[PDB]
Each structure stands twice: as C-alpha cells, then as structure tokens.
Amino acid sequence: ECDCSSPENPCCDAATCKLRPGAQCGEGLCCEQCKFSRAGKICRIPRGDMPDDRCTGQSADCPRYH
C-alpha cells in the first residue's frame, strides 16, 4: 500500500510509493503541496443551510459532521 494513488505524484518517493521526507500528504481536499492545509479552511460547501466543513490541520481529507 501506497500513500499516493498515482506514481506520478511527486508527494511520494517513487521507489517506495510512500510519502517523501517531510511530506504530510499527497492527496485530498485538505492537502496543499504535500502538507496539511490550514486548520479552519473551508473545504466543502453544501447547498442550503447545512454546515460547511473545514480542514483540521491534522488530516488531508475534508471532514464531515455526523
């Protein structure tokens, strides 16, 4: 298993398919240049008045309220 889906992704070492040194992530709504996006950054807009989702600063995915 690999940190990045695609071998083209520079966030991962080609040889291992694991994140390159210093990288936090390689993909997701909350990944920017191989690092976690800023905590509190909007990452998902619903229609209507349901709450938006924001990045946590500790994960590369955009969380959901449940």
Curated annotation (Swiss-Prot):
Disulfide bonds join C2-C17, C4-C12, C11-C34, C25-C31, C30-C55, C43-C62. This is Disintegrin rhodostomin. The chain holds residues 410 to 475 of 478 of the full protein. Residues 1-66 form the Disintegrin domain. Inhibits platelet aggregation induced by ADP, thrombin, platelet-activating factor and collagen. Acts by inhibiting fibrinogen interaction with platelet receptors alpha-IIb/beta-3 (ITGA2B/ITGB3). It comes from the Eukaryota. A motif (Cell attachment site) lies at residues 47-49.
